[PDB]
Structure 1
């Protein structure tokens, strides 16, 4: 990392304190930039979804994996649920998305409540596996909310065989009143749905797949209990990457867990965290970890700074740990504190190979939480922290241990009133990163790290320019 001449502050820096200076560039178009990562995770975009119960669902897993990202399943998830989620994710199609399925005997209220599980805007009515109609938000309005969806479903919709080129589907949907194309299997059953923006993204994004050509997925494990057995079970379940997560990664228990997991020779990339120092990164890498997760404090659901005073600004910790890992040949992930695409761009320019996003993705349709409405009826969801699931651990002892346990924080994440979907957030993030690469003059992320020039700004410098629209920021 190269800083401007004389920019040597006497304090640690956050994302708001730094800026990127443009350089001489030959990359003109954003599409000339390669966003693939080199840390062995297999993602084609630098976006990773945090192992939080409020974001890491199966719908989010499928949606993020199709666009090139990866989702880490939260720790302490039962192995049966892990197996079911992995099977569902790996049974999905690489291009066609899974729609919301409704029965003709469902009520209008149930249809309107299930319509918001995806970002397609419409659901397919299925009778014996075959599509027979579409249900939209407009059709549910102005009717009895306990009427059957059979009386409101429209029987005319665009249909194409599965495997059709996305441009043909786009041309077919160019003149359709509903921007949903129902793709069917050769026998006639429902294969899925494809929208116009879905076709555009299928032409823009590359899915993150394994050796067998199926969508990738990761799983997280804690350091309590028998870490080796849990890691072996998760590897057998089909996880493509293992994360050993704890609040304070620089301790003997985490080193023992890393050694125990590495001694099994599972053949999967190993991620450990979290540390904010170079010594902790070196210890984690020497223990056997391939990737080090960096960040203690900047989590949006984290109250460690206010309760203990322990923490560190994320930018300085990321640059230090990235320098240490590069000196040891490892890689670092930047976890926590991401609100804008500029945060992802600065984390990538700081030397990180991947950025992990948590509560920001909670305000989407694909997140497992329930959709709620505030005073102004603006859509929002609720994000909450993992709390004691990230900590080291009769009814008397349970109460005694819980008296000092970290509480579960809670925040409201507003959905974008115009888009709402997580793929739009991915579009914003990737557009910002590509524009950063074009401004710096880099064709890929390593060149972005090697060519970037950074400077320090005051509080008045951060207020320059125009803010982002609502829903584009956490």
Structure 2
């Protein structure tokens, strides 16, 4: 990557320390930018959801796959749960999203708690598989928590058969009191819902799909136990990409695990991490990993820097690892440290094929965690780290190891008061990346990497401009 003349600092750089210098551009519109990655992950946007149980959820898997990203299922997850998640995700419609379905015999408290699992803001009441009404927080207020859904269902809603183009669906929702359109199967049963903004996103985003046309989903493996058997089980479960994830990827056990997984001829892209050095990246690639995850410390839930002093500023680690990987024909993923879309844009300009986002997406409706409200009624979700699940492996022995494992760091991730869904965060990230590409003058991510000119700034340089509003960032 090219830097400005004289911009050779005596220290490693974070995303806060660097900026993109605009160049001559033929890309006028942001829609002219192709955001598809070339690392073999199949994502049409450079966003990858981290393999953390607080963020990598089933609903998030479906949503991110529909919007073009991929979700790495967290490691040590039961094979039955992984198989169920893959079966559900790969059965989802490419355009129509799955709503919250309630039977009329359900309770009002159950409806209210289930309502916030999606960004639609309304839940479809179905009887015998056919939609009956919409449950909304407006009609659930002031109602007994254990009344039946029959007493709160709203009999009016917009219907359209599945397969209708987003144009008419957007037109139908022009003056609908509820912004949710209930898509119906040709036999009349519920096929899903299409939000007014969901139609636009379907027109804009191309879903990340496998060879069979189903939504892509990834899974993660630890290096504890028989890594080969776990990788084989995850491959047979339907995972389209395997991630070997460890806190310290540049270690002998990681190389052995990569060799074991790569020796099975599994036919899937191999992701290994994390390393922050060129030597670690080259060792991981030579072990058999096609993609090398980058970043030790910048994770928002990571306490390695404060507890151990071990780490590296994410931007410099990503540039070094990307240079090392593309020297050998591999790719890298920027993992951790993503707070703003500028972080994604700089990671892509740094040479990363994909950017892994963790705790930022935890503050979304689609996150597996339960939505919580603080004393000010501001919605939030708890984000927690993988902790021992990312480490290398009688109650006495359990407590003995547990005395030294890193604690589970917990943080409050406030939801956007109006745009709390993960689709809105994806919109912000993709719009920022497309703006970066237009400023650089690139129609695709590889052109963004080759054509980018970067500079170094001080704290005052980062302080320039308007901060993003609350909810738009982590």
Query: Aligned to 1:194, what secondary structure does the other structure show?
Result: strand
Post-superposition offset of 1:285 = 0.7
Post-superposition offset of 1:110 = 1.9
Post-superposition offset of 1:148 = 2.0
Post-superposition offset of 1:175 = 2.6
Post-superposition offset of 1:394 = 2.0
Q: Deviations over 1:195-249 (max 9, x none)?
A: 1101000000000000100000001001111111111111111110000010111
Measured in 1, the distance between the counterparts of 2:146 and 2:81 equals 33
Post-superposition offset of 1:318 = 0.4
Query: Aligned to 2:449, what secondary structure does the other structure show?
Result: helix
Q: Deviations over 1:6-53 (max 9, x none)?
A: 111111101100111111111110000000000000000000000000
Measured in 2, the distance between the counterparts of 1:67 and 1:311 equals 32
Measured in 2, the distance between the counterparts of 1:234 and 1:143 equals 45
Counterpart for residue 242 of structure 2: 242
Post-superposition offset of 1:317 = 0.5
Post-superposition offset of 1:403 = 1.2
Query: Aligned to 1:13, what secondary structure does the other structure show?
Result: coil
Counterpart for residue 297 of structure 1: 297
Q: Which runs of 5+ in 2 are unaligned?
A: none
Q: Deviations over 1:40-82 (max 9, x none)?
A: 0000000000000001111000000000000000001111111
Post-superposition offset of 1:161 = 1.0
Counterpart for residue 151 of structure 1: 151
Matches within 5 A, 1:272-291: 272-291=272-291
Post-superposition offset of 1:296 = 0.4
Post-superposition offset of 1:107 = 2.4
Post-superposition offset of 1:445 = 0.6
Post-superposition offset of 1:395 = 2.1
Query: Aligned to 1:117, what secondary structure does the other structure show?
Result: coil
Measured in 1, the distance between the counterparts of 2:294 and 2:410 equals 23
Measured in 1, the distance between the counterparts of 2:405 and 2:350 equals 34
Measured in 2, the distance between the counterparts of 1:107 and 1:250 equals 52
Measured in 2, the distance between the counterparts of 1:317 and 1:228 equals 29
**Higher mean C-alpha deviation, range 419-428 or range 160-169:** 160-169
Query: Aligned to 1:292, what secondary structure does the other structure show?
Result: strand
Measured in 1, the distance between the counterparts of 2:463 and 2:357 equals 24
Measured in 2, the distance between the counterparts of 1:332 and 1:87 equals 28
Q: Which runs of 5+ in 1 are unaligned?
A: none
Post-superposition offset of 1:143 = 2.9
Measured in 1, the distance between the counterparts of 2:107 and 2:219 equals 37
Post-superposition offset of 1:152 = 2.0
Q: Deviations over 1:139-181 (max 9, x none)?
A: 1123333322212212121111111111111111113222111
Q: Deviations over 1:85-106 (max 9, x none)?
A: 1000011100011000112122
Query: Aligned to 2:193, what secondary structure does the other structure show?
Result: strand
Measured in 1, the distance between the counterparts of 2:173 and 2:388 equals 49
Q: Give aligned pairs, total.
A: 474
**Higher mean C-alpha deviation, range 390-399 or range 455-464:** 390-399
Measured in 1, the distance between the counterparts of 2:279 and 2:388 equals 26
Q: Deviations over 1:338-395 (max 9, x none)?
A: 0000000000000100000000000000001111111211100100001111111122
Post-superposition offset of 1:83 = 0.7
Matches within 5 A, 1:107-256: 107-256=107-256
Counterpart for residue 348 of structure 1: 348
Measured in 1, the distance between the counterparts of 2:454 and 2:103 equals 56
Measured in 2, the distance between the counterparts of 1:214 and 1:162 equals 17
Measured in 2, the distance between the counterparts of 1:236 and 1:110 equals 35
TM-score (norm. length: structure 2): 0.99
Measured in 1, the distance between the counterparts of 2:185 and 2:346 equals 44
Post-superposition offset of 1:431 = 0.3
Query: Aligned to 1:404, what secondary structure does the other structure show?
Result: coil
Measured in 2, the distance between the counterparts of 1:146 and 1:74 equals 35
Post-superposition offset of 1:400 = 1.4
Counterpart for residue 396 of structure 1: 396
Query: Aligned to 2:116, what secondary structure does the other structure show?
Result: helix
Post-superposition offset of 1:427 = 0.2
Counterpart for residue 17 of structure 2: 17
Query: Aligned to 1:470, what secondary structure does the other structure show?
Result: coil
Query: Aligned to 1:119, what secondary structure does the other structure show?
Result: coil
Measured in 2, the distance between the counterparts of 1:198 and 1:396 equals 52
